[PDB]
Enzyme design. Structure first.
Site, PDB file in Angstrom:
ATOM      1  N   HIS A 103      -8.484 -15.230  66.936  1.00 51.65           N
ATOM      2  CA  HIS A 103      -8.727 -14.647  65.586  1.00 51.65           C
ATOM      3  C   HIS A 103      -9.686 -13.438  65.623  1.00 51.65           C
ATOM      4  CE1 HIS A 103     -11.971 -17.850  65.417  1.00 51.65           C
ATOM      5  NE2 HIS A 103     -12.644 -16.823  64.882  1.00 51.65           N
TER       6      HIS A 103
ATOM      7  N   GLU B  13      -5.669 -20.606  70.753  1.00 52.17           N
ATOM      8  CA  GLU B  13      -6.808 -19.888  70.115  1.00 52.17           C
ATOM      9  C   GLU B  13      -7.710 -19.227  71.162  1.00 52.17           C
ATOM     10  OE1 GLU B  13      -6.496 -19.147  67.166  1.00 52.17           O
ATOM     11  OE2 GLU B  13      -8.491 -18.198  66.813  1.00 52.17           O
TER      12      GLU B  13
ATOM     13  N   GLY C 175     -20.507 -17.138  62.214  1.00 53.04           N
ATOM     14  CA  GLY C 175     -21.404 -16.511  63.201  1.00 53.04           C
ATOM     15  C   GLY C 175     -21.404 -17.232  64.540  1.00 53.04           C
TER      16      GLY C 175
ATOM     17  N   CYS D 130     -18.550 -18.390  66.189  1.00 57.16           N
ATOM     18  CA  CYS D 130     -17.251 -18.275  66.904  1.00 57.16           C
ATOM     19  C   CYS D 130     -17.460 -17.486  68.195  1.00 57.16           C
ATOM     20  CB  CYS D 130     -16.108 -17.758  66.033  1.00 57.16           C
ATOM     21  SG  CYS D 130     -15.627 -18.983  64.772  1.00 57.16           S
TER      22      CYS D 130
END
Length: 182
Positions: free
Chosen positions: A41, A72, A146, A148
């Site tokens: 992402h 991911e 904050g 990730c």
């Protein structure tokens, strides 16, 4: 404070950079040579900022399992003038549950941040932001925006990167040794 935080600190001090994309600032784990990982992402493009320096992306691959399900994890090769310490021998070979993990973050917003998250479950399937995702680890800590790209470690293992949360639980994508064979 103890040997868990010792290992986490050793990884953060040598094997992390601050990555900036058009989607934000992320903790980015360097694994070996010029190869690093970031959550998918982050939407890595042709150019990325690494510690506030314009950097060409030589290759970027959003990983999916052999069911063609999102993992991911994006593996990025950076046009950087310096290699990372090779930490591939700290990566687990198989999917597993863990005790006594630490989540560590380093950004402009959260410098030198370490969180003891405790027990880590092999959760497996998660609908992450509407996207079916596999190989998810779960810990019972109320992780926030904050975090990730944050690195999940135990003593002697680098086991995942933080990719989301639901306000009560936090979720990481597994790192496996097999992702980084060359």
């Amino acid at each position: 404070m103890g040997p868990g935080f010792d290992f986490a600190q050793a990884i953060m001090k040598k094997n992390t950079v601050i990555a900036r994309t058009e989607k934000g600032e992320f903790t980015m784990l360097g694994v070996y040579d010029r190869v690093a990982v970031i959550p998918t992402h982050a939407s890595v493009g042709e150019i990325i900022y690494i510690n506030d320096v314009e950097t060409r992306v030589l290759d970027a691959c959003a990983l999916r399992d052999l069911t063609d399900t999102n993992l991911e994890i994006t593996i990025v090769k950076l046009d950087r003038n310096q290699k990372f310490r090779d930490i591939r021998h700290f990566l687990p070979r198989c999917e597993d549950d863990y005790n006594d993990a630490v989540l560590s973050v380093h950004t402009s917003k959260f410098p030198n941040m370490y969180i003891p998250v405790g027990q880590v479950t092999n959760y497996g399937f998660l609908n992450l932001g509407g996207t079916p995702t596999h190989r998810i680890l779960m810990y019972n800590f109320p992780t926030r925006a904050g975090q990730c790209g944050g690195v999940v470690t135990t003593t002697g293992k680098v086991i995942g990167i933080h990719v989301g949360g639901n306000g009560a639980q936090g979720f990481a994508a597994m790192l496996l040794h097999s992702y980084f064979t060359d």
